[PDB]
Paper text:
Salmonella enterica serovar Typhimurium (S. Typhimurium), a gram-negative bacterium responsible for innumerable cases of acute gastroenteritis worldwide, utilizes two T3SSs, encoded within its pathogenicity islands 1 (SPI-1) and 2 (SPI-2), to invade cells and establish an intracellular replicative niche. The core component of this machine is the envelope-associated needle complex, which consists of a multiring base, an inner rod, and a needle filament extension that protrudes several nanometers from the bacterial surface. The entire structure is traversed by an approximately 2-nm channel that serves as a conduit for the T3SS protein substrates as they pass through the bacterial envelope. Furthermore, four residues at the end of the C-terminal α-helix, three charged (K66, D70, and R80) and one polar uncharged (Q77), form the lumen of the channel and create an electrostatic surface potential of alternating charges, which spiral upwardly about the needle, a feature that has been proposed to be important for substrate translocation.
Since we observed no differences between the structures of in vivo and in vitro polymerized needle filaments, we solved the cryo-EM structures of PrgIS49A and PrgIV67A filaments assembled in vitro from purified mutant proteins. These mutants are located within the C-terminal α-helix and resulted in specific phenotypes, such as constitutive secretion (PrgIS49A) or deficiency in the secretion of SipB (PrgIV67A). The 3D reconstruction of needle filaments assembled with PrgIV67A fell into a single class average involving more than 99% of the particles. The 3D reconstruction after 2D classification generated a map with an overall resolution of 2.9 Å. Although the helical rise is the same, PrgIV67A filaments have a smaller twist than wild type (63.27° versus 63.35°). However, no significant difference among PrgIWT, PrgIS49A, and PrgIV67A was detected in the structures of the monomers extracted from the assembled filaments, with a Cα RMSD over 77 residues of 0.152 Å between PrgIWT and PrgIS49A and 0.225 Å between PrgIWT and PrgIV67A. However, the predicted electrostatic potential of the lumens of filaments assembled with the PrgIS49A and PrgIV67A mutants showed significant differences with wild type. To clarify this issue, we fitted PrgIV67A monomer into the map of PrgIWT filaments and found that the resulting lumen electrostatic potential was essentially the same as that of the PrgIV67A filaments. These results argue that differences in helicity itself may not account for the observed differences in the electrostatic potential of the lumen surface. Rather, it suggests that slight differences in side-chain configuration may be ultimately responsible for the observed differences in the electrostatic pattern of the lumen.
Numbering used by the authors:
A (entry chain A), B (entry chain F), C (entry chain Q), D (entry chain E), E (entry chain K), F (entry chain R), ...: 3 to 80
Write the structure that this text describes.
Amino acid sequence: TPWSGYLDDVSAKFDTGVDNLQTQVTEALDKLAAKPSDPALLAAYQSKLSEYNLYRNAQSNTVKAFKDIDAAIIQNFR
Amino acid sequence: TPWSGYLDDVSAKFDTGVDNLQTQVTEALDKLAAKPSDPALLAAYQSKLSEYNLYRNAQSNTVKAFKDIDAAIIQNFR
Amino acid sequence: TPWSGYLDDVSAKFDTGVDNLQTQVTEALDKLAAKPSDPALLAAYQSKLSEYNLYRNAQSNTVKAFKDIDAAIIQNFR
Amino acid sequence: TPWSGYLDDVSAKFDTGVDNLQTQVTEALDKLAAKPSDPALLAAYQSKLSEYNLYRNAQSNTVKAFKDIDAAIIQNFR
Amino acid sequence: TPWSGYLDDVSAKFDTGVDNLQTQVTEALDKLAAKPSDPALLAAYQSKLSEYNLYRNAQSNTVKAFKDIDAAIIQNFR
Amino acid sequence: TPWSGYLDDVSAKFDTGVDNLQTQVTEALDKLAAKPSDPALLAAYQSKLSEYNLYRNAQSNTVKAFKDIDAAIIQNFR
Amino acid sequence: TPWSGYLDDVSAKFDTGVDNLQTQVTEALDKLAAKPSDPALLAAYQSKLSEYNLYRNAQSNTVKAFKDIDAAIIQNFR
Amino acid sequence: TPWSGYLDDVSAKFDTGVDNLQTQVTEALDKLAAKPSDPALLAAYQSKLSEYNLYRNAQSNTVKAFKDIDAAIIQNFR
Amino acid sequence: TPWSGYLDDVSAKFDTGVDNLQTQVTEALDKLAAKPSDPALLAAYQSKLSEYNLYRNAQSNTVKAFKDIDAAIIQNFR
Amino acid sequence: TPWSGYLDDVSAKFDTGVDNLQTQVTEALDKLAAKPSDPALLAAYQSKLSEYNLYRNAQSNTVKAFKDIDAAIIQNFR
Amino acid sequence: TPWSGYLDDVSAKFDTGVDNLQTQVTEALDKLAAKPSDPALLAAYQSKLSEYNLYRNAQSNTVKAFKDIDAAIIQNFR
Amino acid sequence: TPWSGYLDDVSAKFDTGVDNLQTQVTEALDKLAAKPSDPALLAAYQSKLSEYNLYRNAQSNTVKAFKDIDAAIIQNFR
Amino acid sequence: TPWSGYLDDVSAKFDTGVDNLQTQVTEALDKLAAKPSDPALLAAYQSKLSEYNLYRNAQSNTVKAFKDIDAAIIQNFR
Amino acid sequence: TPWSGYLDDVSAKFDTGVDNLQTQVTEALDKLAAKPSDPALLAAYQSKLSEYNLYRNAQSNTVKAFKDIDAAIIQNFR
Amino acid sequence: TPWSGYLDDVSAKFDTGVDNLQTQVTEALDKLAAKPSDPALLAAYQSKLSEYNLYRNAQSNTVKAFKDIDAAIIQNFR
Amino acid sequence: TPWSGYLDDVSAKFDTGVDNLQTQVTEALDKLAAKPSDPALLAAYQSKLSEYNLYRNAQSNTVKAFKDIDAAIIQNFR
Amino acid sequence: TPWSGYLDDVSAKFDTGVDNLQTQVTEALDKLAAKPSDPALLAAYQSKLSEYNLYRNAQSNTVKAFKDIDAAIIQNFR
Amino acid sequence: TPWSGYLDDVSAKFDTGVDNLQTQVTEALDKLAAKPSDPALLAAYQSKLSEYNLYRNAQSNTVKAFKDIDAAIIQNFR
């Protein structure tokens, strides 16, 4: 088992909270790239890519938020 | 009963002053990680994570403040 | 009763200041999704979704504004 | 009459120098929370919250400034 | 009545000179720990904790200053 | 008399500089809403709403500009 | 004649170096507030407010720079 | 039973006055070393390590204080 | 077996508490350097580099904290 | 006429060398507390409070410097 | 009239040479104990307590110096 | 062989991780500059310049991240 | 000719080592105060004020360094 | 075999108690000097140099402590 | 051959440990000054200047660390 | 010849590294101000003003970088 | 002509060896007290007060050194 | 040939043991005073001035140590 800290666990709550959004965005891009004019495939990939953009920003800004909490505690050790 | 000094009591006034903010931030992260696009869940987790950042900095800077008071008294023992 | 800090109270003044805007936007979307060509339903959902966008940005930028006030006070504890 | 030191008097010159800015910000938030789309209420609360942010930072950085003056005098007692 | 020497009387001029600063800092910490995001409670506890830090350092460096005066007189007894 | 800081005075130079533009936009909307096809009422409300959009943006970006000046001075107090 | 130290003289070289920039920004705001849609008045007030922002930051960061020079010399007195 | 003098008894009043602070600091370091990003483990170890720093300085400066009392009595034997 | 003091043992509790974080950060940098645009590789390396920054600061500020405890005991030997 | 020693005369060369800096800092705080957003009042109080911080540190470190000169002469009386 | 020897007269030249320094230090401590954060009261009490420390050491080391002169004359009586 | 430190090795993992992205962006600019209307050359240079922007920001923010780790360790040497 | 000791000669090696840096900083401030927006005048005054800050700290920490050497030799006279 | 007294034996209990700390600090400096940016080499050399500082102070203050014991016994020979 | 003490040898282990980092930073500045917009020259000079900042701080804090070891041994000579 | 320190020489490597960029930006502004609609003059002044913005930021952040190196060396003189 | 012994002549070699250092320190304090923020006046008064501290300690420890020589000769008269 | 006792020979073993450290510190100060911002000249003068501080303290505390040995032998002549 590889080691995981508290920021790894917070960043993996997002990774397991979405189920296969990393796969669904890759699968919706592959269906759309084969036919980039189907409105059903464009509106599916809009709703997947916009869901993936909010997933990756909420994941990144939460790891950065707890890292700012932790660095201000460690500053008070000395 | 485990031992607790004066800095432990000051750091636990913050811990008991918030009731379950350590739980509410963990619960708001778990609801948000399952669906990181609900504005009701993002604005809830913004108000929880920002409340937890101010909790942990006021807790840390108060234990550091009383430790600076105490170390300047102990310096005058000799 | 769950715990609520000062940022929770500011973020819930917006939540109780609007009455059921979280419901009215959900109800106007459900009426519009069943018939997305009625001008009465589109102009209702325009006025609800634009009112909800300003609600969520004023809520988020006020919790962020008071968190910036508080973090600059806590910085002066040490 | 409760006791007030010199830092309490400096921090209360700011408190009495503003008259009811602690009330005007609370009253402008309550008017804005009931209707967070009036430009007259948003521009009023912008000018109040920004005035309150500068009030609380000038109050905090002045109490910290005189505490740094005093601690360097007390250091020279021994 | 318990015995009090000259250093006890100097250290109790500070204790009675502040009235209930040992209580006001404890009461401002208890109000702040219940809600560590109110700017009125943070700026109150900043002005109390900084006033208590200067109280305890001026008390300690004055007892140490008179103890250095007294030990140099007692050295000249023999 | 209610308290007004420097940002309140700058934001009220715009409020008194326009005379009743908050009223003229409300009155031009009420005339236009009763008959939204008169070109004299549409071209009047275009010139009022565009004048009100520039009023509210110049008011908001000037209060924000002086708040950025003030926060950089207060940062140099400590 | 009121007393002026070296930081007062440095902060007043900026005050006399600009001639009436404190007046020209106040006069350009008063002309702009009466008519916040003239491009000649907006581009004048842009060039004045941006000139005043750089004036107040260069004034503040120079008084802070010499205060950091002086405090490191005074630290070496003891 | 091993021998203990008066400085050993004073240094062991601190050792028995804290109960298992030598263990609690070792246990809080072991929990923190396995995951040095949990704010609950950092704020616990801040309050333990700062409590242990004040314990070891008050223990050391009290044994040194009584040793200075005793050496000045023994000097007067001859 | 090489010699290890108490600061070496504290600094190696962090080294063995993380398992292969020195390797996982090196491996996540090598995967990211080959393709610095994969969001899965950037969000992995964010969570590793931020975990490594908190590891190295908590390790360094704990060795410095115990060195400050020890140097104040050794000062009381003479 | 109250008695004044050599340290009192050195500490009063600073008190009379500044003319009314103890008043100008109190007057600049009172003007700033009534309106803590005027850049002219903030930059005035920055230049006064920074001038007062250097005044009180140069006064304190000079009385401490001559007290260290005098105590080393008095040590050579016996 | 109580009896006073030559060491009493030397120790009372210091007592009458300072006028009410025993009172001025007691009065400056009483003003400072009521408000131990005023820089005017701390810098006054620094200059009084340091003046009193040099007064009591010069008084004690002069009585000890003349007692060493006298004891070496009396040793030559036999 | 020129000297390379640890930041040079981290900044050259990015340089060797991309193979000839510094060349491919230069070659795609040279093809595009000769004919800046081919959609095949614009979409190639979009995908190269955006890949180069993410390469140079991940390279720069990683050298800055390890420099912040190292400077906080070196601060604890003294 | 006024008297100059060894610390005066060391502090005047810095004064004559820079040629007219006390003048060049005063002249660059006077040019900048007349126009605090020229990038050529700001980057000149940055390079002068930063050169003057390093001049005054190296001058002060060298006079303090030799004074610490000398005071430890004079301590061994008795 | 060279001669060794009791202070030589106490100072060599420290020399043999550490095994090759004089070598490990020299070897950690040589690895760090070749690459003074590796966090693994900086945190190793922090833990070695801080361990060597406590070794040399405990060695020096113990030889000085026993020399003070011995010189007070030899004083009582005559 | 010029004389070199132990601090000179420690400060020259850093000087010879880096090979020509004093030259590589000077050469990377000269290439960058001729064209301060090449990302290859900026990212090279970032990695050189950050490597030189860590070199000069680790060199300075190690000479200061051994000087603190040596001065505490020399203090125990008398 | 006027005096120039090391920060002056670094800030003048940028000044001589660009040849007449301070002139070319002034000349491109003068050509553009006479006719602010020529695309050849706008695209020339874009490439000059963006080149001048990167010149002045790389010049300023390098003088600040070496000033941070120097101030940390001078701090270790005492 | 007043009488002067050998300790008076040694203590007046220091008084005439410095020329007007008793005046230059008084004159540098009077210039500094009128403006305690000029770096030229602070660095002048640092170099004067540190020169006066070494003057008064070398004067006092030399009169004490010859008094210890003389008292051991006079002890051998009987 | 001038006369030299045993303390002169011990104090000149240090003077000839360093070769021209009295010159190298004077030469490194003269190079640094001409340009007090070169990191190569500051880190050279740090390593020279710290080497000279340890030279003068080890020289002074060894002459004082042998003078304490000799004065206790001469005391036993009578």
